[PDB]
Write a protein that binds this ligand. Structure first.
Ligand SMILES: [Mg+2]
Ligand SMILES: [Mg+2]
Ligand SMILES: [Zn+2]
Ligand SMILES: [Zn+2]
Lengths: 308, 308
């Protein structure tokens, strides 16, 4: 059994975003919209339900850990359910949470060379936190092969490079390298059950589709409904293809991609505050439900029993 | 009228702390303790109730802004009540929140030379955030004289250096300079009402006591009840005098200091998760109340009408 816990399901900024008064964020505050608040994307994995692996550490991490009981087993005066942390990129929304975990250092952190470089230069988390009882102990994620964290020995992670979208602070935002962004394939080596996790998805080729058909659950990018969604809300100028996000609707959309996977469980995660799928009375939400696609939410439990 | 809003009232780690199972943190989780959860220290100031000045930006800033309506006036699709931010030090618990405000850059940030140096080197917030539409616009806080932020033109800030307790990540944690830590004197130039804000207080001399008697409200360090509180809870080895905190109880304690101020309003803020004053049925809470001292809490409103 693989326990998957959605701690956060919103894109950077959360929902509602602190400075946004779009139809969703204002509709939530005014109470004229059936929607649920969401923290920034983060999931937790376990093979036993006691030892947990954190995938990305959001700025909302303190609230995310409180809301989930197994994170505090109370086995000692100082304790936590987090046994390791895996980083998919060096983005602010996925790494800032590490600052809030300074009291429980050291931590085993799994990231790539490129992420480790960003987190030792532009955003030197590894250098800052080292002053807290050991800090972050880096475990390299090589772009090939697989890795197993000793706390969840039945979990097999097989990373794959996705199209690079390096953070703005990054020394090489203008010079993208493989290793800037990862999608994860987690396998329960007891059952063969596979999870395809890719909150940041901006390009999908035929070799990516190949391994997706070997998965049982697809947990992927759901940031935007339209590529120009930020303009249609009048809160931004950036498009999904600029930010490296494949929108649900349109040609080469996620809904077009996911349509070739009728046998897999399909969940949209990392959802921006402007996305109408957050509105449960929205026709967009209807089309998503109609296609057998779920909209992740804070507190969602995904249990992986077996392979099909 | 000076509007003072306590966004956060806990010391670093908040209450309860994510990894702590002391008598307070566990007593809260078990429901066997009458106490209220608290976010990390942060207050907001205003002279009109519309334009707000943020004093320190905690990691819990997203929740702190949500809980307080005037932070989102909804005057445009993109808006906020924060017009300026003042930093008292370069500590993680007071600066990390700036990362969560990246969507609404630029911001006018008020800090000292030494804080600006820490926030451009060890924790380069000013360098990172500049990639977000201008980033942080530094306004120097000189260690003498006063300053007025144009958004609250009736508020007069007069900073004073306190005993230096530079952060662990800081290049000069071993080489303390004046300007590492500030206490603030805010004056309503319409009424003469003065606020003495000093969440980090580890030493008090006769010249500090002098200006305290010119204040109407004392908003000061309430981190520990005893200097060896971390040892008595069995969760730490550090003492208050090591961390630069004057404990309430004992010789040279805050309660001993505050005893010479029977005419001022007295509020304890920046309170650690191990402090028994968080327990409302505690004899420590009783002694604090008996002396006319209040225990700050998240959501507390302090209104300064006049001078006495
Ligand atoms: Mg993001
Ligand atoms: Mg602190
Ligand atoms: Zn919005
Ligand atoms: Zn505690």
């Amino acid at each position: 059994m693989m326990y998957i816990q959605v701690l956060g399901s919103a894109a950077g900024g959360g929902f509602p975003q602190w400075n946004c008064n779009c139809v969703n964020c204002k509709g939530y505050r005014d109470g004229t919209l059936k929607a649920t608040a969401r923290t920034q994307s983060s999931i937790a994995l376990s093979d036993d339900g006691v030892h947990w692996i954190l995938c990305n550490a959001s700025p909302d991490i303190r609230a995310q850990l409180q809301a989930f009981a197994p994170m505090q087993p109370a086995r000692a005066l100082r304790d936590t359910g987090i046994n390791a942390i895996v980083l998919l990129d060096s983005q602010i929304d996925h790494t800032t949470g590490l600052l809030s975990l300074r009291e429980g250092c050291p931590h085993q952190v799994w990231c790539t060379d490129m992420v480790h470089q960003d987190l030792t230069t532009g955003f030197p988390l590894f250098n800052m936190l080292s002053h807290w009882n050991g800090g972050l102990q880096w475990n390299r994620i090589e772009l090939e092969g697989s890795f197993v964290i000793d706390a969840c020995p039945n979990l097999k992670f097989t990373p794959f490079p996705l199209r690079s979208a390096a953070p703005p602070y990054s020394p090489h935002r203008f010079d993208p390298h493989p290793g800037d962004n990862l999608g994860l394939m987690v396998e329960d080596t007891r059952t063969g059950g596979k999870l395809f996790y890719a909150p940041g998805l901006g390009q999908v080729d035929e070799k990516l589709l190949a391994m997706m058909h070997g998965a049982d659950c697809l947990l992927v990018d759901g940031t935007l409904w339209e590529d120009d969604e930020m303009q249609r809300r009048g809160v931004g100028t950036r498009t999904g293809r600029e930010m490296g996000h494949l929108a649900q609707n349109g040609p080469g959309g996620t809904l077009e991609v996911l349509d070739g996977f009728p046998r897999q469980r399909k969940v949209l995660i990392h959802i921006n505050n402007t996305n109408p799928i957050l509105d449960e009375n929205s026709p967009e939400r209807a089309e998503v439900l109609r296609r057998g696609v779920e909209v992740a939410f804070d507190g969602m439990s995904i249990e992986l029993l077996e392979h099909h």
